[PDB]
Each structure stands twice: as structure tokens, then as C-alpha cells.
Amino acid sequence: VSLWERFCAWITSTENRLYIGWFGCLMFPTLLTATSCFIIAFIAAPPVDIDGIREPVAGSLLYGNNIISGAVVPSSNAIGMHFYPIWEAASIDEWLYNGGPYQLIVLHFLLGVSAYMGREWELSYRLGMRPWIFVAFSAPVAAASAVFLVYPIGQGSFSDGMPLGISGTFNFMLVFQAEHNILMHPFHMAGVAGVFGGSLFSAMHGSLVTSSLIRETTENESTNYGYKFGQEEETYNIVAAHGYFGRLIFQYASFNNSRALHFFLALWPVVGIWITSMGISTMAFNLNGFNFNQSVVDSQGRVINTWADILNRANLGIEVMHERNAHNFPLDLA
């Protein structure tokens, strides 16, 4: 009867086209502002002093870029970790010079993605679902907050944060290799196993369902039209695909249970990306990966090279060349 109850009834209605919910009250204003500023800053945005040395790095399309090289540049080294909104900038020209829109996009992104995650919970509550799709979405939220939030914190500047682009991503990955040795760190190892394993069990499960489909169509029409939507009959012989994989490797390595099978597809990647995103986090605070340089010696004591020493000389090439003007002192403490 009241105005608030007629508003709570609408905002929590599943009869809307897109469910809004109470998290959409701060998902939609956040992500539309992260979007509408991203499209403008990617297309039309002046160059940005990223190294704090007043050498402005172009990143937008109107200043001679493309899809690959164009990128929303991170904020300055001069700012660093300080909060830099528009009203604390004394003009928009001073805001866009010092890496303004990187903080406006990222902070409205991480609020909107952490609200998109809670929105996946909310609709599962109002639909009668068991709730935990949003726990599986915690794994890219852990990884998005690792390269945009946690790594600028432990390194003390948003300038070490990830550039919102495509070539800026590979500037981020290579400089992160030289300074932290991520490939030898066992948490990037535990998530390469998460996505190689994840793409394995995806294409391994998706093939054994498509292999054992039941005849419901003719050879002229499509294979997919043998599934009517909302039917109650099972659309594939699960005993058939169990007997196949029960002979392809051996018998006891096969899940006859389809529920425990469809749980292992959700376990393996998500655990692999939780562990990986806490690799960037523990390497944000300079707890680097393994270092086996000069580890094998002869009885005389001369250093015998290994593959890690060849990997070290690739890291030394990126270390002596990243931010080639920003350094003045012999050790990259930042």
C-alpha cells in the first residue's frame, strides 16, 4: 500500500526483463559510469604522464592508435596511491594529464563487479535455486581485484596497475615477469593447470554428451532440434558415455554420478583461479617466485648454467629496459 512497499515489490520482482535487485541499486550506476567513461577515454583522451617524468604516453584512438595499441593509461607515478577524483584536480585538463580516468573507471568497476556478483546471489534466492553460482564468479573477481587494486597497493602506486588495453596488458605481463618471476611461482603454475585442465574437462565433457545423443532427428535437419525445451526426458544415454570413458582410460577413473561429474567441472578452474589470484597478491608485496640462479656448481665452484639461468637472462633484459627513464638509482625498489 505504501510507496516503499510498492517500490520494493518492483525492484525485487523476477518479472522484470532483467532482474535489478538490491545489488543492482549499486551495480547499474557503477558499471554504466565505468562504461560511459571507458568508451570516451578509449576513443578520445589526451596523452597521460604515466612515469611521472612528464613524458605523456598516448593511449586513445584519436591520437593515432588502433584497437591493439590503444589503451586507457594508468595514473601517474607523481600521484601514486593518492585518491585523485575530478573535484580534487582544479581543472579537467589537469585531471586528464595526470591519469585521471584510470581511477574513475577502475573504482567504479570493482564496485560494480562486486555488486554483479552479489546480484547473482540475490536472484538465486528469489528463484528457489541453491545459491552458489556467485562463489564460482568469485574467481575472476579475485583476479580482477588482484591486478587493478591489490597490485597497485603493495607496489604503492596505480601506475604499476594494469593498463586498460590490449598492448598495455602485455606491457603489464612482461614487466611483472622481470620484477617478480611469476612463471616460477607455484600459483601461476596452479592456474595454468586450472585453465589447461579447465579447457580439457570442458571439451572432454562436451564431447561425451554430444557423442551419446539419442536419435530424435532425421539426417536432413539439425542435430540440435532433438531437444525440445523444458522436456523431462533425458537427452543422452549417460550409460553409453560412461562405458566409453570406462574403456578409454580404465574403469575406475570414470564418474558414473553426473552430479559429482558436474561438480568437478566447477571445482578445478575456480580453485585454480583462486590460487592464481593469490599469486599476484603475494607477489604484490614482493614475495616473488622461485630463484634458482647460480644453484648448480661444480666441485671447483664455477657456476654451471641451468634453464633458470637462461630464463634469468630473459628477465635481465626486461628489467634493464622497463621504464627506461624513470629510474635514477641502481635497484628497482618499485
Binding site: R17, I39, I43, L61, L62, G64, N65, N66, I67, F229, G230
Partner: peptide
């Protein structure tokens, strides 16, 4: 002149995302 093509590819991609969400073929039981 060159960046005009890149912008048209980007907003043209966001058009077909708009039509796929709102003008989707709504699936129906029976």
C-alpha cells in the same frame, strides 16, 4: 580517417549485442 573505421567496428559490435539481449528469440515450453 583511419580511426573512423575502428570506431564504427566498435559501436557496430555493441549494436548486435543490444539486439541479442532484448530482441532474443524467447524460448517457450510447448
Amino acid at each position: 580517417m583511419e580511426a573512423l573505421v575502428y570506431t564504427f567496428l566498435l559501436i557496430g559490435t555493441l549494436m548486435v549485442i543490444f539486439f541479442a539481449v532484448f530482441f532474443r528469440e524467447t524460448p517457450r515450453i510447448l
